[PDB]
């Protein structure tokens, strides 16, 4: 197999600007078995990694563009695993992961974007965000009371948190992603879409295996109970912050190998639009390289 069948499926995963979203209805969380096999995918996935390494190697040397890659997802979605697998084939000098956590005091003394702007990737580098500024329209939207404890949010009472407030954030975010898009950054955003069913399965597997037992937090359940509120926030974000510049992609997360294949595939596709090449050796340089070979060969 090859990428022929998949390539049309991928197009559906892109979120078109301002198209309405029904996550339960429209977007699946498991792969259709009629498309590919787990074995076929593992082979293509492997091509994806090697091809992504070539791109990264050319991106580093070209030093013209940076790449920002966002991963947003519910707990047990497979973010960390996805990040890890994608970075296994890359060179660690041109790639940084930043796994954003609950803000620090210093971070809350700044606008909510500041800690993200600070962590942006440089020319020739790939930055990966395991969670992002989009947390400020997700967990914060499910729990508006947090806003009261962010001095910079400008939210003094809970009643001033309305759809106009989130529209204003979408705009802020969109302006942010537009400015960096206009200044060298290729932004790609992935929503790893895991279903309640598979989340419950993974949560239990985590709770039964001693290797993962110690790690499991019970607060993850508090957020599962707000599934519907999270679905509302995701759907609204997706509709208002996916652009042709900074597109969102909804990726099914119930089958991990398949999640990893799609993401690898989409990153390659989007970065191939840059037409990256290794630098060419001029005649002058080729002559210098050949003088050096001669010197080495003519050693006592
Ligand atoms: N209030 C607040 N404001 C913010 O700006 C912000 N940014 C991030 N976060 C919170 O940091 C927590 C990150 O901790 P975590 O439980 O270690 O998340 P993961 O390990 O990636 O899930 P996992 O189960 O390991 O997922 P995978 O298996 O897919 O890796 C999450 O609850 C986020 O809501 C924020 N909270």
């Amino acid at each position: 197999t090859d990428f022929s069948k998949l390539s049309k499926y991928v197009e559906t995963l892109r979120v078109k600007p301002k198209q309405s979203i029904d996550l339960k209805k429209d977007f699946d969380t498991d792969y259709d078995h009629k498309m590919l096999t787990k074995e076929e995918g593992e082979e293509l996935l492997n091509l994806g990694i090697s091809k992504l390494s070539e791109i990264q190697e050319k991106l580093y040397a070209s030093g013209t563009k940076s790449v920002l890659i966002v991963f947003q997802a519910m707990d047990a979605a497979g973010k960390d695993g996805t990040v890890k697998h994608i970075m296994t084939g890359l060179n660690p000098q041109g790639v940084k992961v930043t796994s954003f956590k609950v803000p620090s005091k210093i971070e809350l003394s700044h606008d909510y974007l500041w800690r993200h702007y600070v962590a942006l990737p440089a020319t020739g580098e790939i930055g990966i965000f395991n969670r992002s500024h989009y947390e400020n329209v997700l967990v914060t939207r499910v729990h508006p009371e947090y806003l009261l404890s962010e001095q910079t949010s400008g939210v003094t009472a809970i009643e001033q948190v309305n759809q106009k407030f989130w529209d204003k954030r979408f705009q802020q975010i969109n302006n942010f992603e537009q400015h960096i898009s206009e200044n060298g950054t290729i932004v790609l955003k992935f929503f790893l879409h895991v279903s309640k069913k598979e989340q419950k399965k993974r949560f239990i597997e985590r709770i039964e295996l001693d290797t993962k037992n110690w790690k499991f937090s019970t607060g993850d359940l508090k957020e599962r109970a707000h599934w519907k509120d999270y679905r509302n926030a995701y759907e609204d974000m997706l509709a208002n912050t996916s652009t042709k510049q900074a597109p969102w992609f909804v990726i099914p997360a119930d089958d991990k190998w398949f999640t990893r294949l799609l993401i690898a595939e989409i990153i390659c596709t989007e970065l191939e639009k840059l037409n990256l090449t290794f630098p060419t050796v001029s005649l002058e340089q080729k002559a210098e390289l050949e003088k050096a070979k001669a010197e080495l060969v003519a050693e006592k």
Side-chain angles (χ1 to χ4, degrees), residues 181-194:
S181 280
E182 291 161 349
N183 284 264
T185 313
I186 307 307
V187 188
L188 310 175
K189 309 176 257 168
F190 297 89
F191 168 44
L192 280 54
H193 188 197
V194 66

Side-chain angles (χ1 to χ4, degrees), residues 14 17 39 74 90 104 115 130 136 142-143 148 152 186 190 207 216 237 255-256:
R14 171 178 334 243
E39 225 203 351
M74 294 294 284
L90 300 207
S104 67
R115 88 195 176 128
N130 193 340
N136 302 102
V142 175
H143 307 276
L148 296 179
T152 69
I186 307 307
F190 297 89
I207 285 169
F216 183 82
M237 168 210 87
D255 284 279
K256 295 193 175 164

Side-chain angles (χ1 to χ4, degrees), residues 4 6-7 9-10 12-15 17 19-24 26-32 35 37-42 44-53 55-95 97-176:
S4 54
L6 278 154
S7 186
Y9 181 51
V10 167
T12 67
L13 309 181
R14 171 178 334 243
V15 177
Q19 54 141 115
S20 73
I21 330 289
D22 191 337
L23 286 167
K24 196 97 234 158
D26 297 331
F27 300 85
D28 272 7
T29 66
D30 53 31
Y31 83 111
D32 154 274
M35 222 182 298
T37 69
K38 207 214 202 216
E39 225 203 351
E40 291 170 321
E42 275 160 8
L44 259 69
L45 176 50
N46 205 303
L47 285 176
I49 294 308
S50 322
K51 179 56 186 161
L52 195 26
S53 201
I55 301 170
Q56 184 271 314
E57 189 174 358
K58 299 180 191 170
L59 180 70
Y60 193 85
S62 160
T64 45
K65 297 269 174 221
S66 61
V67 177
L68 180 55
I69 294 172
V70 182
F71 292 136
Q72 280 295 157
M74 294 294 284
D75 305 83
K79 269 181 288 82
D80 187 283
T82 295
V83 177
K84 171 152 131 103
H85 188 91
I86 274 197
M87 246 169 126
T88 53
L90 300 207
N91 201 277
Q93 247 189 101
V95 198
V97 203
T98 310
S99 309
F100 296 91
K101 307 300 206 176
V102 167
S104 67
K105 280 214 270 287
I106 289 179
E107 286 165 347
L108 294 163
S109 75
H110 283 288
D111 64 275
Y112 67 95
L113 285 181
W114 173 88
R115 88 195 176 128
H116 291 104
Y117 223 116
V118 160
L120 283 178
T123 318
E125 285 186 350
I126 301 184
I128 290 180
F129 279 7
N130 193 340
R131 293 178 193 266
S132 53
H133 32 302
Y134 290 102
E135 291 288 327
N136 302 102
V137 300
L138 299 166
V139 72
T140 308
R141 187 178 194 163
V142 175
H143 307 276
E145 59 277 9
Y146 301 168
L147 292 169
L148 296 179
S149 301
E150 305 182 356
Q151 327 91 262
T152 69
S153 67
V155 167
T156 37
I158 307 292
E159 319 105 45
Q160 24 175 177
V161 173
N162 42 65
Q163 179 72 47
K164 272 200 195 181
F165 182 90
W166 307 115
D167 292 329
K168 174 63 97 187
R169 281 203 172 179
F170 300 151
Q171 190 208 9
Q172 282 172 357
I173 288 166
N174 285 321
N175 286 347
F176 162 61

